[PDB]
Amino acid sequence: GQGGKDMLSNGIKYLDVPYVAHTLEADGPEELVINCDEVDCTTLVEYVLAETLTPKLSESAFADNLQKIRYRDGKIDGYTSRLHYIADWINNGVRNGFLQDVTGAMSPDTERLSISYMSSHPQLYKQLANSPENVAKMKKIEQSLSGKEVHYLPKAKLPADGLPWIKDGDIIAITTNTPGLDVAHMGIAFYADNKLLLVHASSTDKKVVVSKVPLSQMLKDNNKWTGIRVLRMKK
């Protein structure tokens, strides 16, 4: 449908934008940061979704949509209000009416969430390493996310040519066997000559690209990547 076409075309607008890590991590209070010229895999998806959700004929409306995507119920309240874990990010979008969990309906396979990476490794995050308060807030979030079943598509069940229930513009969250982490990477689904490719911010290519191999191959090539969750904008 048109929503998917628009998600895809807005993602295509980001081709060649440089990959830069940690663009949201300035010192000081957590505030809404907009850096559309330097992205990572998650900020790319957030900007594309925010733009596509914003009716087009507004900087203020774009920012408001970005805020509702990036923060728990759209309320900015410190580092831990940012939806760092993609399971939580998905739940926020489902609860607040702007995402559908497509794998939730279409894939019979499920995995029990076990989320704890950030509190387990606080040295890796500036806003945790010296903030026992933030670490405690993250542990509470982690414990509430963990133990829930979610649906996913195991990577062996994803063909090169995709599946008919995965559509152009869908948001792809790549599941991972890293202990304590649910999702490792994200991008936007793009069928090119019937192959299901990914539009994504690639750290290796140092920019936003159309994948050279199908999503199925991307998954095969990383032993830690176990499958995908498929989400869809609801507008």
Ligand X SMILES: CC(=O)N[C@@H]1[C@@H](O)[C@H](O)[C@@H](CO)O[C@H]1O
Q: Which residues bind ligand X (CB under 6 A)?
A: 24, 40, 42-43, 82, 84-85, 118
Question: Which partner from the list ligand X, Na ion, none does 24 bind, CB cut-off 5 to 8 Å by kind?
Answer: ligand X
Considering the complex, state which of residue 2 and residue 194 has its C-beta at the smaller distance from Na ion.
194
Q: Residue 154: enclosing H or E segment and its boundaries?
A: strand 153-154
Q: Which tokens is 163 given?
A: 């599946």
The one of Na ion, ligand X, none whose footprint includes residue 82, by CB under 5 to 8 A per kind, is: ligand X
Q: How far is the CB of 180 from Na ion (least distance, A)?
A: 7
CB of 185 to ligand X, least distance (A): 9
Distances (CA, A) of 29 to 78, 151, 218: 7, 35, 37
Are 128 and 118 spatial neighbours (Cβ–Cβ below 8 Å)?
A: yes
For the chain, how far is it from start to end, CA to CA, in angstroms?
12
Q: Do 151 and 121 contact (CB within 8 A), yes or no?
A: no
For 11, other C-beta atoms within 10 Å of its C-beta total: 28
CB nearer Na ion, residue 64 or residue 111: 111
* Helix, coil or strand: residue 39: strand
Would the CA dihedral through 140, 142, 146, 148 be positive or negative? positive
CB nearer to ligand X: pick between 103 and 116: 116
Q: At what angle do helices 86-95 and 59-70 cross, to 10 degrees?
A: 120
Q: What residue 111 binds from Na ion, ligand X, none (CB within 5 to 8 A, per partner kind)? A: Na ion
Instruction: State the binding partner of 103 from ligand X, Na ion, none, CB within 5 to 8 A by kind.
Output: none
Smallest separation, CB 125 to ligand X (Å): 7
Instruction: Please tell me whether residue 111 binds Na ion under the rule CB under 5 A.
Output: yes
| Residue appearing with tokens 């793009």 | 190
Query: How near is the Cβ of 235 to Na ion at its closest, in Å?
Result: 30
Q: Min. distance of Cβ 138 from ligand X in angstroms?
A: 9
Size of site (CB under 5 A) for Na ion: 5
Residue 43's binding partner among ligand X, Na ion, none (Cβ under 5 to 8 angstroms by kind) is ligand X
Alpha-carbon distance of 3 to 183, in angstroms, equals 24
Tell me which residues touch Na ion (CB under 5 A). Answer: 111, 176, 178, 181, 194
